[PDB]
Design a binder for this molecule. Structure first.
Ligand SMILES: [Fe+2]
Ligand SMILES: [Fe+2]
Ligand SMILES: [Fe+2]
Lengths: 171, 171, 171, 171, 171, 171
C-alpha cells in the first residue's frame, strides 16, 4: 504494498482482525439478552432497555477498529459470527453475572494486543488502544460489580419484589 | 402453553425464525461493502455512506420481527451468521448489481411466508407482512434498477471519470 | 505586642488554637466515611454524597476560626492531624451512630470555650460563639437523631432492602 | 479477592497509598502560608488569595487518587498528616521559593510511581499518571520560576515598594 | 543550570532543536507550491488556497515545539532555512505526489525522536509527541493518498478537463 | 514571453526578487526576539506578544510582493533565508534599538527600488510602492523612537523596576 503503509507489522494486522470479530460477538450476546426480558412471563422493561443500549455500543467499537485498519493500510477479513451459549438466562442477577464475566474476557484480550504492539515498537497503535478502549472497560466492570452487589443484598433471586423494585428505582 | 397464544401455528413460528436470520445476514453484507469503498486505492466516499445507511436499516427490520414473535407468544431461536461471499467487490457498478440480486431473494422469501400464512387462515400475520415489508421491497428494487441503468449509460466500468461524477451528482 | 490587641487574654488565645485542630480532625473523619460507601462491595451512592458534603463544611468552620484569631491580634499555631479510629465502618446505621457521637463531643468543647470567655469578661468572643457555632450544632444533632430512629424502625442492620430504600427515598 | 480486580499488583497498591498522604500534606502547607499573609503586620491580600487557591487544588488531586484506588479494587489506608516546618514564612519571596522547592519533590515522586508501573506491565495506570498529573506539574514549576525571577529583579526583599507593586499588578 | 530543569537530557535538547528546523523547511516548500498555481498560464485557484493553508499549519507546529523547549528549561538555537528543490512543479498530480513524499519523511523523523525519548526514561516527552504529533501525521498521509488515487483514475496528467473538474468538485 | 506582460523591465523583475527575500529575513529576526522574552530567567510577557505580532506582519508584506510579481507577468525565484546575528538579546532596551536599526535598512532599500522604477518610466510600480509600503515604514520608525526615549528616561537598563513597569503600562 500500500502507498500509505509505514511501520505496520503483519502480526499486528492479524490481531486487529481477531479483535473485530470479538466485538461483533459481544453485540450479538447483548441482543439476545435484551429480547429475553421482553417475554410475557418475565416482563421487566428497564432490564430490556439497558441491554439493548449495550448492544448498540459494541457495534460502534467494532466499526471504529475497521476505520483504523483502513487508515494504516492493512486489509480487513471477516469470519462467521457464532451464536451465544444460552437461549434462556433465568433471572436478572444471572444475566448481570454473565455480562460481568464477558467484559473481563474482552479486557484480557485488549491487554495482550497492547503487549504485542509494545514488542514491535509501534507507538501510534499503543496510544490508540489507551485513548479509546482501555478506560472504558474498567468503568464498565466497576458498574456491573455495583449492580451485582446491590441485587444480592436486596434478596434476589428468591424474591420477585426485589427485582421489581431494582427495575423501578435504579434502571 | 403461553397464556397469550391464540391461533398461531407451529409452522409459522418456525418460518419467522428463518426470516430473522436472513435479515441479519443482509445487514452484514452491506457492512462489508461499505468499508471496501473507504480503502485508499478506491476512495469513493458517498458510495461508502450509502452502503452504511442500508446496513443500519436491515438491523431494524430484524428487530421488528423479534418484537412480533414475542407479541404472539412464540419463542426466538438464533443461529450462526455466515460471512459474505466476496472480500473485494471490484468496482462501483458490480456492487450495485450484487445489491439488486440480493434484494430480489429477500422479496422471494417474503412471498412464500405470505402464502403459508394464507393457508393456515391467519389474518393478523398476513396484514403485518403487507403493512411493513412488502411495499418497501418494491421501492428498493426500483431504485437499484435506476442506478444500474444510469451507470451503464455513462460509460462505466472502463471509465473512472464516470464513477467520480456519479458519486458527486447523484449520491 | 500587636498594635490592634485590646482586651484579649492569653488563655482564650490558647483555647482557640485547640478548637481549630478539633474541627480539622472532624473533616478528616467524614472524608474517610465518604470513601467507604463508594467501594464495590458496599455501593451506596447517596450515603457517600452526604458524608462528602459534611466534610466540606467542617473545613469552612476551621477557616473561619483562623480569620477570627487574626482579627483580634493573636498568633496561629498548628499541630499534627491524627488519623481516624476505624478503617472499615461496617454498615449504614453504625456510621450514623458514630457521627452522632462525634457531634456531641464537639458541642461539649464549644460549651467550655463559652464558659471561659465569660469568666474573663470578653463579650465580643461570647457573641461570636453564639452567632456562628451554637445553633448549628443543635440542628445537626437533631437531624442525626431522626436518621438513626428511622433506620432502626425499618429493620436495619439485618435487612439489605431497608438500607437500599432509605438511600433512595430520604437521602 | 475483589470481584473487579484484574492485573493490579500489591506494590502498586502500596505506592498509591503513599501518594495520597503526600498530596494532603501539600494542601496543609499552602493553608499555613495563606493565613500568614493575612496578619495585620504583613497585610498582603493577593498573596493570601493565591495561596488559598493552591490549597483548594491539592485536595482535589488527593480525592481523585482515592477514586482510582476504589475503581481498580484496592483498599485505602490513611496515616497521620504531619504539620509544616515553618510557622512564620518571613517575606513574599521566601514563600515563593519554598513553594517551588516543594513542587519539585512532588514531581520526583510521581516519576518513580510511573517507573514502577512500567516494570509490572500495567498500561492503564501509566496512562492515568500521564493524562492527569504529569503536565500539570511542569506548568506549575514554570509559573513559579517566572514569579521568583521578577521579584528578584524588582529589588526584593530589601524593598517594601517592590512587593506592594507586584501584589497589585501581577497577582 | 536552569532553575526549572529536572530529568531533561542533553541529547533530547539537541534533537528538539533539529525538529524545529525541519518544520520551518516544510512551511517554506508549501509556500512555493501555493504561488506556482497562481500563475496566469496555470491558473488553478483552489489548489493555491489548499497549499496556503498547509503552509500556515506547519508554522504553528514549529512555534509549539519552541514553547516546549522553553517550558522544560533548554535553550533554542536556530540555523539557516534552505530553499526548496524545484522552482516549477509541473502539474497538479506531481505536486500532490511530492507532498506525500515529504510528509512520510517528517513522520520518520518523529518516530526516531520517540525512540530516543524512550531510551532515556522521559515520560512527559513521550506523551507530548503522542498527544500532538503522531495522529495528525497519519491523517495527513491518508488524505493525500486519496487525492492521488482519484486524480490518476480521472485521467490526469494528459487531460486538462480532469484537473479542472477535480479543482471544482473536491477542493 | 508571458501573454500579460506590458512595459515591465528585466531589472525591475530582479529587484522585486531581492525585496521578497529581505522581508522574509525580517520576519525570522522578530520570531527569534519573541521567544527570548519567554525564557524563565527573563520572563517579560508583553514584550513577547509585541514581537510575535511584528513577525506575523512581515510575512504578509512578503506575500503581497509575490502576488504583484505574478500580476505583472514575471517569475518568482527564492533563495536561502539566513539565520539572525544574535542568539541572546540581553535586555529590553537593546532589543528595541536593534529593531529600530533594522527598520531603517528596510526603508533605505525601498527608496532605491522607487528610484529605479522612476528611471525606466514605470508609473504603476511607483504608485504601488507609495500606496502600500512607504508610509507604513515612517510610522513604524516613529513608534520605535518613542519607545527608546521613554525607556532611557525611566532609568533602564540598570534598573529592573523600570522594565517591569514599562511592560505593564505601555505594552
Ligand atoms: Fe460537472
Ligand atoms: Fe418504594
Ligand atoms: Fe504603578
Amino acid at each position: 504494498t500500500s502507498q500509505v503503509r509505514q511501520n505496520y507489522h503483519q502480526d499486528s494486522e492479524a490481531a486487529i482482525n481477531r479483535q473485530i470479530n470479538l466485538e461483533l460477538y459481544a453485540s450479538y450476546v447483548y441482543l439476545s439478552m435484551s429480547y429475553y426480558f421482553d417475554r410475557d412471563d418475565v416482563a421487566l422493561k428497564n432490564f430490556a432497555k439497558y441491554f439493548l443500549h449495550q448492544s448498540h455500543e459494541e457495534r460502534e467499537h467494532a466499526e471504529k477498529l475497521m476505520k483504523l485498519q483502513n487508515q494504516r493500510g492493512g486489509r480487513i477479513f471477516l469470519q462467521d459470527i457464532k451464536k451465544p451459549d444460552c437461549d434462556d438466562w433465568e433471572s436478572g442477577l444471572n444475566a448481570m453475572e454473565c455480562a460481568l464475566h464477558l467484559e473481563k474476557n474482552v479486557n484480557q484480550s485488549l491487554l495482550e494486543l497492547h503487549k504485542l504492539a509494545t514488542d514491535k515498537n509501534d507507538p501510534h497503535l499503543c496510544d490508540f488502544i489507551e485513548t479509546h478502549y482501555l478506560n472504558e472497560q474498567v468503568k464498565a466492570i466497576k458498574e456491573l460489580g455495583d449492580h451485582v452487589t446491590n441485587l444480592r443484598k436486596m434478596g434476589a433471586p428468591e424474591s420477585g419484589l426485589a427485582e421489581y423494585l431494582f427495575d423501578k428505582h435504579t434502571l
